[PDB]
Amino acid sequence: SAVQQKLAALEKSSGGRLGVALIDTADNTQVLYRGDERFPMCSTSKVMAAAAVLKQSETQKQLLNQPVEIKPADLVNYNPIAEKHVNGTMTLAELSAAALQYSDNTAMNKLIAQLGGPGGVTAFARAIGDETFRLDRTEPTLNTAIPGDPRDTTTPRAMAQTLRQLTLGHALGETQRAQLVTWLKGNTTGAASIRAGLPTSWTVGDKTGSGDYGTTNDIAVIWPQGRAPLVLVTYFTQPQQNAESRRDVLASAARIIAEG
Ligand SMILES: *C(=O)N1C[C@H](NOS(=O)(=O)O)CC[C@H]1C(N)=O
């Protein structure tokens, strides 16, 4: 297929390893490139942690309003929102929003804590039928993105399927799903990734991530106007530990998928 040849060429031009999964919910068709290879998730894993807490809130109806202390000891490498509330509290809703929309790593660690450790996040993946996702570590070490290391990885195919179920499907209750969709649509970190390769008019909710080995990721739900939505996962990683991020590769992959 032409899309396959163009993604392969993009990959060749980039010097890295590119993973793409597209699901067209119009006809449930899929486009995959290295769809079954493992990639480090880095911050894209936060969608699963947030969704897991939302699933808890279906029975614990006030859970999202639960205050959680932010202490100095809780701060890690990237805490844009949590640092604003040190020695105070944030609710689990606020932590979820911070994790998703600003990619706050302290917020992610509080979500993991709420779920009883990385094993609790992974259990939620298994619960909704994702047998591929694995979260092994907490922030910041889950972003080491070491080649061949299976920790904290998933595949593009798996992540696309799961993101579909969480946002467009019914893995979550209706109020929860709507909340997740709202958070994703309000992401502030994605302008140069998938979004940059799509028609400006299209509505996108996404979660970015990056890590060592120039790992550069984005997962997205896309709502074209007058057309069934799409799920697009783009993972990218490189052979040098100190490689720079390549968000342009993700934008380019999205463009190739969109029809450009
Ligand atoms: C997620 O991959 N991380 C936390 C934060 N994410 O910002 S990003 O999604 O815009 O890339 C910074 C990078 C990364 C990390 N190494 O902690």
Author numbering: 27 to 57, 59 to 238, 240 to 288
Give the exact sentences the study uses for this entry:
The results obtained for HEWL and CTX-M-14 demonstrate that SFX using X-ray pulses with megahertz repetition rates is suitable for high-resolution structure determination using the methods described in this paper under the exposure conditions currently available at the European XFEL.
This enzyme belongs to the extended spectrum β-lactamases (ESBLs) that play an important role in emerging multi-antibiotic resistance mechanisms. The SFX data collected to 1.7 Å show a complex with diazabicyclooctane avibactam, covalently bound to OG of Ser70 of the β-lactamase, as also reported similar by King et al. for other β-lactamases. Measurements for CTX-M-14 β-lactamase were made in the same manner as for HEWL, except the EuXFEL delivered 300 pulses per second with a mean photon energy of 9.15 keV and a higher mean pulse energy of 1.05 mJ per pulse, giving an absorbed dose of 0.9 MGy using RADDOSE-3D version 2.122. Merging reflection intensities using the program partialator in CrystFEL produced a data set with an error metric Rsplit of 0.197 and CC* of 0.984 to 1.7 Å resolution. In particular, the structural data obtained for the CTX-M14 avibactam complex demonstrates the potential of megahertz SFX for structural discovery at newly available high repetition rate sources, opening up new possibilities for rapid screening for drug targets using on-the-fly substrate mixing, while the potential for rapid data acquisition will facilitate the generation of time-resolved movies of macromolecules in action at physiological temperature.
